[PDB]
A paper describes a structure:
Isocitrate dehydrogenase (IDH) plays a critical role in the tricarboxylic acid (TCA) cycle and catalyzes the oxidative decarboxylation of isocitrate to generate CO2 and α-ketoglutarate (α-KG) with divalent metal ions (Mg2+ or Mn2+) while reducing NAD(P)+ to NAD(P)H. In accordance with the preference of coenzyme, IDHs are divided into two forms: NAD+-dependent IDH (EC 1.1.1.41, NAD-IDH) and NADP+-dependent IDH (EC 1.1.1.42, NADP-IDH). In the present study, we investigated the overexpression, purification, and detailed biochemical characteristics of a type II homodimeric NAD-IDH from P. tricornutum (PtIDH1). To our knowledge, PtIDH1 is the first eukaryotic homodimeric NAD-IDH structure proposed in the type II subfamily, and it exhibits a unique EF-hand domain at the C-terminal. Enzymatic characterization has revealed that recombinant PtIDH1 is a completely NAD+-dependent IDH and exhibits allosteric regulation by isocitrate, similar to eukaryotic mitochondrial NAD-IDHs from O. tauri, S. cerevisiae, Pisum sativum, and Solanum tuberosum.
The apo form crystal structure of PtIDH1 was determined at 2.8 Å resolution in space group P212121, and the asymmetric unit contained two monomers that form a dimer. Each subunit of PtIDH1 in the final refined structure missed several amino acid residues, including Met1-Val4 and Lys487-Val495 (15 residues). The monomer of PtIDH1 mainly consists of three distinct domains: a large domain, a small domain, and a clasp domain. In addition, a unique EF-hand domain is observed at the C-terminal domain of Gln424-Lys486, which is composed of a helix‒loop‒helix conformation. As with all structured homodimeric IDHs, there are two clefts on each side of the structure, which are formed by the large and small domains of one subunit and the small domain of the adjacent domain. The putative active sites are located in these two cleft regions. Additionally, PtIDH1 contained two insertions (Ala84-Gly91 and Ser323-Ala331) in the large domain, specifically forming two α-helices (α4 and α11) at the active site. Moreover, the dimeric interface area of PtIDH1 (4082 Å2) was larger than that of HcIDH (3638 Å2), and at least a 1700 Å2 interface area was provided by the EF-hand domain of PtIDH1 at the C-terminal. Therefore, the dimerization was formed through the unique C-terminal EF-hand domain in PtIDH1. The structure reveals that PtIDH1 EF-hand loop contains several residues (Asp459, Asn461, Asp463, Phe465, Asp467, and Glu470) that are aligned well with Ca2+-coordinating residues conserved in other EF-hand loops, indicating that PtIDH1 EF-hand loop binds to Ca2+ by canonical coordinating mechanism.
Author numbering:
A (entry chain D), B (entry chain C): 5 to 486
Write the structure that this text describes.
């Protein structure tokens, strides 16, 4: 064994089907080739989080700032039923607040693609930057009765306390809501967003409700300033500002969610506030395929100012497939998002190892080894899917189980690492019918109803005319240029 | 000479094409049969609002409290350019805050229908209660720097000032936002909403994001408590809780916005917060022709306890047709929404007259006179549309001008009031192709792209399969139950 020593990396584990499948993937695709040992595991199981009163969470955050590259598994934010069943003494919420605080912010939700010949919802990649902090999700509130509410601001600027808002609550049933948006890291965000769009040949956009909530116009201002100063020239010089008329376009929240579903050939990126970005990314996810086919990557700033990158899949622990496994029924979990997050974490760990130790040879070379490996591992997994041996949500009921999918990808991976151009090339495909998706069984009787509805002619005479009627009746016909 | 005396009613006038067209409708359809004179006009033109520094709006509010029945025309909330041209020296905003304060609240957005046989988007009436007060639209905010923000609540319950939220703002560019919801009049709202859904055989629903925004859970509670206590029995007696499973259903606002577009059969009602209600009623408007086909009716409480009702169309002053009118080019403005508002205001004025003066004979029958009149007035307007002599956005290019339509409806109204059944009945119609809508021209080659290409299967040859997939790929196929 002369295996490569993987760079230091934080590894946060959860429970259930995703813990089982990540364990399977690391053992089959990584330990064959890597000395881990510099990985720093943390058990964020519900039970382990509760016994340590979340000291394992404070240790994961600490390890993350010091190391700066972290893969995290899906975790259970236990519901009351689940909190009782597990019997956790002192309920603890989502670890997200801890991580996003300890590491600074922004949350990249970009579509996953099988660049070797499986079409998905979007023909070309989509990027999305969901501002990691601020907004309604972090609001403080209280139900209050009669009186007056007073919002003061106390500057460290030495100046006098500021009356932000004062109001006279006449009712005996009120709710009051207060929150903030921190906007410093909007200019880092812009640089991350615009630059990654440059590299990818993506037309970028900014999405807000700034016309209606004027407190949001700061966001768009910084995005605009940074853009005009540093990237507009390079964007036109690549001819990407073309489908948006020469400048960075602002989209109001509610025209954004339409070009999402419309410009279905992809090749666009969007940046937005935390709440809006959550909603819009769920929407992009559904257009592309399912939630597991979207990235969920925190990018933040370490105290020293280096990049902290944390990677996640966009699904939970998948309890029902866990129960199927416990009762000996076969399961078929798509590991795509999980694998993508693991190789992102590993890649950034290698990058940080070289950046933290320049003037070290076998670290700028370890990085290049890592990137070549993750490239041929992607090939092994995409080709497996293309040979019809993907999991059952993509390859249909003849698709492999979780375990034989992992094993078959390891088989191709050991071969691909030694030339091995046997088999033959797998085929180009096309969207596996979305009905293969888990927990998506439609309503064939309803959709009968609606196609016969738009008839009034014969055996569904569409002949475009009905299509046009449909799309206007739908309120989805593209408007004109004007 | 013997015309009926209209009950007292406030009339708020605006500017431009709707002021001219309302003046014409009142002169042609009402003045023939009614002595107005007890109508109390207020000029809320931009110029008169700015010269009086909105004392005209404040007097209108006072008169509306005294009379309680108000028609208001669209008014201009002037844009900077428009404020320049008009030369208004102290900008004054929307009259909405004043009216909703002076009269209490909730904003009714219900679909308008041509009960004599022209189908539109929804087929059966849809009701919507948008909570008139509270929420994000009435927020205080500020740009703040480094420091600490402090939200105090000072009860008149005499107890100690309450720390709603305190937070430690580290950034140098922050925005802070605070707002409230008054929830007393939710139970008035419930009674208003549930009872009218009863009268109309509408299944009611409540829409919130209470699951993600816990402070909204009050809304669902009050609405539910009233329902279960005061209306559930009557709704099941009518078998209206059938498609919603026996009880009052709460919908998260993003499944609401799905059944909106889905249940195109109508026959449902929704109540929501001020902000969500704004967005969802814009969407209901779109499913059903255009925004001008949705009412906008304030309902509030006067000091005496009588209902205060203000009615508006859901469009503006229609500036572009005003430009055309001043240049002597003909215009064709659909007065449907404005008329629906005028006869609603007139009905409520008659109702208030009777309720405020019982032991008065010719007021309880003046009420019935008004209602008979408005019914034959609806028949005349609907029928004119069905004879193809409506305005051109409904009747295509052979439709009449604003002025010819008003004259033709006046002719039919005069004849109908004299038991004159000549002519011959107009036909049943069907949605006038929405391309006839003003300022709505489709990008037919884009929609080519989508039909000619996207659902291939040869030369057109769409039956199901591509329809079903189409609904799947856009994420608009109806799924499974829970």
């Amino acid at each position: 064994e002369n295996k490569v020593v993987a760079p230091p990396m934080v590894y946060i584990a959860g429970e259930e089907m995703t813990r089982y499948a990540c364990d399977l993937v690391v053992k089959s695709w990584l330990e064959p080739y890597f000395d881990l040992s510099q990985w720093e595991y943390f058990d964020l199981s519900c039970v382990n989080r509760d016994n340590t009163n979340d000291q394992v969470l404070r240790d994961a955050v600490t390890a993350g700032q010091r190391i700066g590259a972290i893969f995290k598994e899906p975790t259970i934010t236990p519901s009351a039923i689940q909190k009782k069943a597990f019997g956790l003494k002192n309920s603890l919420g989502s670890p997200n607040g801890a991580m996003r605080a300890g590491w600074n912010g922004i949350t990249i939700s970009r579509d996953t693609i099988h660049i070797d010949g499986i079409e998905l919802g979007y023909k070309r990649p989509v990027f999305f930057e969901r501002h990691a902090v601020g907004g309604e999700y972090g609001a403080g509130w209280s139900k209050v009765g009669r009186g007056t509410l007073l919002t003061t601001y106390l500057p460290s600027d030495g100046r006098d306390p500021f009356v932000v808002d004062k109001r006279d609550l006449t009712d005996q049933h009120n709710v009051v809501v207060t929150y903030h948006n921190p906007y410093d890291n909007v200019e880092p965000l812009a640089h991350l967003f615009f630059q990654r769009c440059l590299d990818a040949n993506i037309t970028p956009y900014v999405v807000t409700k700034k016309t209606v909530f004027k407190w949001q116009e700061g966001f768009w201002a910084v995005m605009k300033d940074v853009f005009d100063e540093h990237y507009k020239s390079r964007f036109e010089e690549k001819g990407l500002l073309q489908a948006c008329g020469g400048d960075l376009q602002h989209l109001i929240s509610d025209a954004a969610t339409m070009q999402l579903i419309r410009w279905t050939d992809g090749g666009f990126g969007m940046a937005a506030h935390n709440y809006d970005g959550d909603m819009l990314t769920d929407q992009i996810a559904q257009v592309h395929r399912s939630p597991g086919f979207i990235t969920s990557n925190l990018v933040g700033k370490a105290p020293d100012g280096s990049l902290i990158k944390e990677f996640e899949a966009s699904h939970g622990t998948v309890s029902d497939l866990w129960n199927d496994h416990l009762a000996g029924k076969e399961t078929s979990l798509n590991p795509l998002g999980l694998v993508e997050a693991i190789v992102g974490a590993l890649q950034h760990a290698a990058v940080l190892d070289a950046e933290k130790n320049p003037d070290d040879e076998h670290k700028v070379k370890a990085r290049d080894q890592i990137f070549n490996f993750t490239t041929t591992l992607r090939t092994a997994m995409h080709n497996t899917f293309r040979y019809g041996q993907g999991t059952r949500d993509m390859s249909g009921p003849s698709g492999y189980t979780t375990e034989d999918f992992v094993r078959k990808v390891a088989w191709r991976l050991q071969r691909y690492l030694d030339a091995q151009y046997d088999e033959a090339p797998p085929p180009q495909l096309g969207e596996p019918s979305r009905k293969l998706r888990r927990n998506y069984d439609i309503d064939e009787e309803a959709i009968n109803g609606l196609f016969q509805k738009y008839d009034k002619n014969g055996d569904g005479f569409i002949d475009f005319e009905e299509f046009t009627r449909m799309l206007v009746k739908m309120n989805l016909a593209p408007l004109l240029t004007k």
